[PDB]
Structure formats: C-alpha cells, structure tokens
Amino acid sequence: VEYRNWSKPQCQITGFAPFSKDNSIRLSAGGDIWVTREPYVSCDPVKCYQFALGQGTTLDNKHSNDTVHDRIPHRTLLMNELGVPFHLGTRQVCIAWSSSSCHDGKAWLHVCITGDDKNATASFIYDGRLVDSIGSWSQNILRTQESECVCINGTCTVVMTDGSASGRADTRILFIEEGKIVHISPLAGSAQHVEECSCYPRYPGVRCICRDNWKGSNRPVVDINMEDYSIDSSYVCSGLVGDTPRNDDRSSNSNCRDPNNERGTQGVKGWAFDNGNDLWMGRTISKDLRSGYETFKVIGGWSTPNSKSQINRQVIVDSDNRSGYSGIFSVEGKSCINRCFYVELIRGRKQETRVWWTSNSIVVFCGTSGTYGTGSWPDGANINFMPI
Ligand SMILES: *[C@@H]1O[C@H](CO)[C@@H](O[C@@H]2O[C@H](CO)[C@@H](O[C@@H]3O[C@H](CO[C@H]4O[C@H](CO)[C@@H](O)[C@H](O)[C@@H]4O)[C@@H](O)[C@H](O[C@H]4O[C@H](CO)[C@@H](O)[C@H](O)[C@@H]4O)[C@@H]3O)[C@H](O)[C@H]2NC(C)=O)[C@H](O)[C@H]1NC(C)=O
Ligand SMILES: CC(=O)N[C@H]1[C@H]([C@H](O)[C@H](O)CO)O[C@@H](P(=O)(O)O)C[C@@H]1O
Ligand SMILES: *[C@@H]1O[C@H](CO)[C@@H](O)[C@H](O)[C@H]1NC(C)=O
Numbered sequence: 001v002e003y004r005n006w007s008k009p010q011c012q013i014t015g016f017a018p019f020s021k022d023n024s025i026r027l028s029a030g031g032d033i034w035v036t037r038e039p040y041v042s043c044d045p046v047k048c049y050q051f052a053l054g055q056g057t058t059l060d061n062k063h064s065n066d067t068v069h070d071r072i073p074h075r076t077l078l079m080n081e082l083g084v085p086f087h088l089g090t091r092q093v094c095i096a097w098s099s100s101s102c103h104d105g106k107a108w109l110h111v112c113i114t115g116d117d118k119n120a121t122a123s124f125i126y127d128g129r130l131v132d133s134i135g136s137w138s139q140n141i142l143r144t145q146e147s148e149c150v151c152i153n154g155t156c157t158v159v160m161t162d163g164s165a166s167g168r169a170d171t172r173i174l175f176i177e178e179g180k181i182v183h184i185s186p187l188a189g190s191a192q193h194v195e196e197c198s199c200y201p202r203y204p205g206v207r208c209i210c211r212d213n214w215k216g217s218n219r220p221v222v223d224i225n226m227e228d229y230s231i232d233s234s235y236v237c238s239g240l241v242g243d244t245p246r247n248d249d250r251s252s253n254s255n256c257r258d259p260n261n262e263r264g265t266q267g268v269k270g271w272a273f274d275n276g277n278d279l280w281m282g283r284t285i286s287k288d289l290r291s292g293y294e295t296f297k298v299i300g301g302w303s304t305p306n307s308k309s310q311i312n313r314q315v316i317v318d319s320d321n322r323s324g325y326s327g328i329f330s331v332e333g334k335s336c337i338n339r340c341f342y343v344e345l346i347r348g349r350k351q352e353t354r355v356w357w358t359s360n361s362i363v364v365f366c367g368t369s370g371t372y373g374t375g376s377w378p379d380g381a382n383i384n385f386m387p388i
C-alpha cells in the first residue's frame with residue numbers, strides 16, 4: 001500500500017449529481033438513531049464513510065432534551081459506511097466535540113477534541129492507536145475543521161484555531177505524520193478569522209475555504225505549502241459570497257483581500273473550490289437563516305474581485321426547507337480527482353420548538369462531467385410525527 005499523493009488533474013465538472021442521503025430523522029421516529037450534528041464524509045481509497053459528532057444519546061430518549069448545546073463530555077465521533085444511518089451498532093471512534101479525519105493511503109487519522117473550553121485537549125489517533133496530543137494554546141475553545149483533513153505523501157494537514165469567536169484568534173496549521181505532529185505553522189497572509197475550514201488537495205498544495213465568524217460574509221482562503229510549511233491567506237474574490245448571514249447579491253462585495261464587513265458576525269461552515277479563474281460554490285438560499293441550499297459557478301469568481309457572473313446553478317434543497325453546515329470531500333477517479341460535498345439538514349430546537357432536541361440528516365452530491373436534471377432533496381421529516 002502506497003501513500004496517497006493526489007497528483008491527478010481536477011476532473012472537469014458540469015455540476016453535481018445526487019449521490020447519497022441517509023434519511024436519519026425520518027427513521028428516528030420509528031427506530032433508535034443517534035442524535036448528531038456537524039457531520040461530514042471522507043473516503044479511503046476504496047469506500048466512503050460518513051462521520052458525525054453525536055450527543056451521547058438516541059432521539060427517542062429523554063436524554064435528547066436540550067441537545068442544542070455544542071460541547072458536553074458525551075459527544076463522540078461516529079463513523080459508518082456512507083449510507084448506513086447512525087444506529088446502535090455504530091462505532092464511536094474517539095471522544096470529541098470538534099473533529100476531523102482523513103486517510104493517508106495506509107490508515108485513518110482522527111483529530112479529536114474534548115475537555116473544558118478554557119483547557120481542551122486534542123488527541124491525534126492514527127491507525128487505531130493514540131499517537132500524540134496537544135493542549136489549548138489560547139485557553140478559549142480549541143476547535144478544528146469539522147470536515148476531512150488531507151494528506152500528501154504521508155503528511156496530513158489539519159487547520160485548528162483557539163481564541164475568540166467574534167474577535168482576533170490564533171490559527172495554526174499542524175503537519176502530522178503517522179499520528180505524530182512533525183511541525184506547526186501559524187496563519188499568515190490577510191485572513192482575519194479562520195474557522196471550520198473545508199480543505200482539498202491541489203497537488204502539490206492543499207487549499208481551504210473557511211468561515212470568518214468575525215468581520216466577513218465573504219469566505220477566507222488558506223493556502224498550505226506541503227513542501228516548506230509556508231501558509232498564505234486571502235478571501236474569495238467573488239461578489240456573490242458564501243457565508244450566512246450575508247448582504248444581498250446586489251449590495252455584497254469582496255475585494256479578494258479583506259473581510260467585507262457586511263453582516264460579518266457569525267457564519268456557517270461551507271466550501272468552494274477553484275477552476276482556472278472560475279469558482280464553484282454553494283451556500284444557503286436564504287441570507288439570514290440556514291434555509292435552502294444552492295450551488296452554481298461564478299465566472300471569474302476566483303480571479304477577479306467582485307465578479308458576479310453566475311451560471312450552472314442547481315438547487316439542492318429548496319428555500320423552504322432547513323439546511324445547515326456543509327463541506328467538501330475529494331475522491332480519486334481513474335484519470336482525475338473529483339470534488340463532492342454533503343450538506344447537513346438540521347432539524348429541531350432553535351428554529352423548531354415542538355420538540356426539545358436538535359439533530360440532522362445529510363444529502364450528498366458529486367461533481368459530474370455528464371448531464372443532469374433538476375430536483376430538491378430535504379431532510380424529509382414531519383415535525384408533528386416526531387417524539388418529544
Ligand atoms: C490545564 O491543564 C493542565 C494539564 O492538566 C493543568 O496542569 C496541571 O496542573 C496540575 C495541577 O496543578 C499539575 O499536577 C499537580 O502537580 C503539583 C506539583 O507541581 C508544582 O510543584 C512542583 C514541586 O516540585 C513543581 O515542580 C511544579 O513546577 C509546580 O510548581 C502537585 O503538587 C499537585 O498535587 C497536589 O495538588 C492537588 C490539587 O492540585 C491535590 O489534590 C493533591 O493532593 C496534591 O496536594 C498535582 O499533582 C500538573 O502537573 C499540571 N500539568 C503539567 C503538565 O505540569 C492546568 O492546571 C490546567 N489549567 C487550568 C486553567 O485549569
Ligand atoms: C467548537 C464549537 O463550539 N463549535 C461550534 C461553532 C462555534 O460556535 C463557532 O465556530 C464560533 O466560533 O458553531 C456552532 P453553530 O451552530 O454554527 O453556532 C456549532 C459548533 O459546535
Ligand atoms: C503518485 O502515486 C502513484 C502511485 O501511488 C505514482 O505512480 C505517481 O508517480 C505518484 N506521483 C507523485 C508525483 O508522487
């Protein structure tokens with residue numbers, strides 16, 4: 001078994017085609033299904049798995065009540081083959097209320113974080129064994145990607161951050177080999193805030209589109225040099241803009257260099273990826289809430305500041321249904337490396353007050369160079385049938 005080096009062109013894509021859906025919440029009304037949030041997907045070189053951070057309880061369980069909280073000692077990282085729902089036979093891989101996993105070609109890496117907010121700890125579990133750990137460096141909630149990491153030639157990269165949510169913070173990029181931290185680089189370039197990065201290979205580098213929870217509704221970009229460990233950061237050029245809350249396609253901007261300061265506070269994990277000068281991206285259909293989800297191509301949205309020439313749009317979830325986080329994952333084809341994405345469909349507490357829990361389902365698409373149609377694929381549950 002050789003290490004993944006991901007050195008193949010990026011497949012030319014025309015849009016994305018449906019790929020998987022787990023119908024988690026619908027099943028929960030008549031089955032024992034894990035309560036989860038912040039899910040994601042990653043594939044080794046043979047099959048794809050679906051991860052999620054559970055809430056140490058099933059839905060039809062009094063313990064689900066008040067699962068709106070993001071960090072309790074009972075959250076663990078669940079892992080199943082893509083498509084099999086989180087039922088009782090699912091393996092809890094580690095203790096973690098924030099995580100990230102990737103396969104380097106020979107084994108899985110799982111960075112798991114738990115602990116007190118002011119003094120959390122992250123364990124780096126590789127190939128089944130705990131190989132290394134690190135502690136909070138800014139005593140204020142050590143957090144990471146919430147999506148897949150990436151490895152080239154045996155070296156994996158995971159961007160992490162400790163600090164303020166809506167304030168300056170400390171973002172570093174750990175370089176890990178076989179579970180062992182072999183280098184740590186600090187964020188450089190012009191990105192103000194970096195959280196929940198959605199990274200992907202780009203031989204010989206890795207590129208990420210993250211979340212700015214402080215001053216920007218445009219998304220930050222983090223470029224990682226696997227060779228010398230140098231970092232660089234910017235914001236995506238597109239004037240279309242992918243964070244939530246955001247401005248309005250009409251009155252929204254991005255200069256490629258700084259937080260646009262337009263409805264900058266708060267956000268949502270998301271993705272985007274480059275294609276020559278164009279950019280592929282997705283985002284909630286609403287600008288205020290996490291409702292609906294669409295994807296499209298912004299002609300010259302990677303290279304030219306403020307571009308808004310959109311085309312090839314697809315609605316994944318209609319504007320009347322809930323969505324949530326979302327991220328990207330790469331799969332190696334025979335001749336090129338393709339890009340896919342999943343989208344979390346949060347249901348429950350916060351927006352929906354009939355029930356007392358909070359959970360999610362998922363729907364996942366992959367790029368295609370072929371043809372495709374139209375549709376919409378939401379969570380699907382009826383809050384009125386649900387327990388609680
Ligand atoms: C964030 O998380 C880290 C890692 O857990 C915490 O650091 C550890 O803190 C504990 C508690 O202080 C350390 O364990 C204790 O070590 C003491 C000795 O260290 C001092 O004294 C020696 C004397 O030779 C010096 O060499 C050394 O430099 C220190 O000055 C022990 O005395 C402690 O035992 C006593 O206290 C405990 C309660 O604290 C009692 O219950 C015991 O009965 C006993 O009386 C204890 O063993 C530990 O070593 C630290 N880690 C490391 C790597 O050093 C942080 O405290 C935490 N931060 C926050 C904000 O929560
Ligand atoms: C480690 C951690 O707490 N992650 C949480 C993250 C942070 O709150 C923001 O990243 C602020 O920095 O966001 C929430 P969200 O529902 O969007 O509010 C879900 C995550 O559990
Ligand atoms: C990438 O890996 C394959 C085998 O895994 C090898 O044939 C190819 O030459 C490698 N390319 C680089 C740039 O390492």
Ligand SMILES: *[C@@H]1O[C@H](CO)[C@@H](O)[C@H](O)[C@H]1NC(C)=O
Pocket residue numbers: 062065066356388
């Ligand atoms: C859920 O918890 C709250 C307080 O923790 C309580 O008031 C409420 O009645 C609970 N409801 C159910 C249905 O468990």
Ligand SMILES: *[C@@H]1O[C@H](CO)[C@@H](O)[C@H](O)[C@H]1NC(C)=O
Pocket residue numbers: 005152153204205226227
């Ligand atoms: C991966 O390995 C090949 C073969 O050893 C090497 O030439 C290539 O540059 C490596 N790539 C990176 C990004 O280290």
Ligand SMILES: [Ca+2]
Pocket residue numbers: 211212213214215216217243244245263264265266267
């Ligand atoms: Ca923001």
